[PDB]
Amino acid sequence: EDLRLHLLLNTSVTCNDGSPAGYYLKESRGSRRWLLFLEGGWYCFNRENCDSRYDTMRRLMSSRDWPRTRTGTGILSSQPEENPYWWNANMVFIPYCSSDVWSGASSKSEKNEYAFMGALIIQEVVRELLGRGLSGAKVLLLAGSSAGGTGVLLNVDRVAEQLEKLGYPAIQVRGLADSGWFLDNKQYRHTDCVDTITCAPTEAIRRGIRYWNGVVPERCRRQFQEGEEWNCFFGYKVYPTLRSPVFVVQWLFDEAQLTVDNVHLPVQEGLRLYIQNLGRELRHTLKDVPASFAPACLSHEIIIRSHWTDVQVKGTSLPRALHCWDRSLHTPLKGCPVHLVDSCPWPHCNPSCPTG
Numbered sequence: 015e016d017l018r019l020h021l022l023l024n025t026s027v028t029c030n031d032g033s034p035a036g037y038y039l040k041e042s043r044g045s046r047r048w049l050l051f052l053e054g055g056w057y058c059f060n061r062e063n064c065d066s067r068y069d070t071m072r073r074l075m076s077s078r079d080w081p082r083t084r085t086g087t088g089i090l091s092s093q094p095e096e097n098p099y100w101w102n103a104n105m106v107f108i109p110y111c112s113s114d115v116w117s118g119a120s121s122k123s124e125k126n127e128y129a130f131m132g133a134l135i136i137q138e139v140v141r142e143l144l145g146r147g148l149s150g151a152k153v154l155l156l157a158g159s160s161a162g163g164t165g166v167l168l169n170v171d172r173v174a175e176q177l178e179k180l181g182y183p184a185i186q187v188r189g190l191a192d193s194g195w196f197l198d199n200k201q202y203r204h205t206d207c208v209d210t211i212t213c214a215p216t217e218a219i220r221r222g223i224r225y226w227n228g229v230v231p232e233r234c235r236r237q238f239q240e241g242e243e244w245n246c247f248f249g250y251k252v253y254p255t256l257r258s259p260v261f262v263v264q265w266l267f268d269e270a271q272l273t274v275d276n277v278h279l280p281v282q283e284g285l286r287l288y289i290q291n292l293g294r295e296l297r298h299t300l301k302d303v304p305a306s307f308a309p310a311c312l313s314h315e316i317i318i319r320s321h322w323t324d325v326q327v328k329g330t331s332l333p334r335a336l337h338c339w340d341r342s343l344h345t346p347l348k349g350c351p352v353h354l355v356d357s358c359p360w361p362h363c364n365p366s367c368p369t370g
């Protein structure tokens with residue numbers, strides 16, 4: 015139980031219900047590497063569905079019941095056996111308690127039952143960590159899984175700008191977005207947005223942005239303009255606008271993508287074609303992403319799983335690819351690839367896929 019909880023000293027930066035947000039920290043004296051990981055867990059976008067989430071997913075809306083410690087797993091593990099990549103780094107786990115894909119900047123108030131402060135939580139965590147050793151960092155890797163991976167895309171450049179403005183231009187800010195690269199594609203079976211389950215991701219995010227006072231990266235906002243900021247929650251649209259180096263990890267047949275597409279797994283021709291087209295579209299969107307790891311598996315999330323080391327693309331594991339990425343950020347490297355996208359067209363055509 016190696017990461018210790020710290021509730022934010024600025025108690026105006028809150029989870030959904032107004033309880034203080036916070037972070038779990040395990041310091042590594044002498045390491046100048048800092049890993050800040052954003053937890054995922056869907057989102058909520060109106061009073062009704064946020065109230066339901068508060069009943070049965072309350073740890074994602076409140077810190078009242080958080081434990082004092084958490085065990086670092088996967089990329090957050092301090093054991094080289096489990097984490098060949100960054101086992102000696104300073105480790106930070108930032109719980110997702112804002113239900114806003116890390117985009118919100120609204121407090122609970124007279125007019126707001128809930129606070130959606132995801133973007134401000136990240137900024138406040140960074141601020142308070144500077145006094146705890148982050149001021150001496152050489153690399154700050156902002157990582158995250160699922161909604162936390164999308165949160166990396168939405169926030170990495172803002173962290174970079176924050177540190178620049180605070181007078182720390184020597185900290186190299188980078189992003190690692192795991193399972194947060196979604197497509198705004200056609201559902202396999204269609205449903206107009208009449209309730210939570212029928213509301214497709216583009217519509218729910220459109221509503222959420224207004225409900226959360228959600229913010230997106232500035233260059234992306236300037237491209238899509240007012241009322242169209244939802245586009246910036248989709249990796250293939252926001253990524254080209256980002257200045258910080260971002261490594262993208264994405265299963266080609268992500269289970270959350272399939273869920274929002276209304277796919278539930280003998281597969282007949284229509285569904286077969288749909289699934290193959292999804293993998294091909296995902297592969298297409300990553301063709302010009304130089305640092306990426308995209309295995310042909312039906313799964314969801316990878317970086318904080320204890321067996322994250324098992325999967326390989328073209329014989330290279332994700333910890334190796336991330337190490338090669340580090341070396342590239344010191345022309346391609348002999349035997350140390352950073353762009354690893356499967357080309358086989360069906361889930362589990364890669365033998366190293368998670369077994370489930």
Ligand SMILES: *[C@@H]1O[C@H](CO)[C@@H](O)[C@H](O)[C@H]1NC(C)=O
Nearest residue numbers: 024025026027134135137138
């Ligand atoms: C606390 O956080 C809020 C929201 O980000 C900010 O407006 C305020 O300046 C912060 N106060 C302090 C003392 O850091």
Ligand SMILES: C=CC(=O)N1CCc2ccccc21
Nearest residue numbers: 056160161164196215247270
């Ligand atoms: C796993 C759920 C999730 O996090 N989803 C689903 C679709 C989407 C679009 C943008 C950002 C996040 C998400």
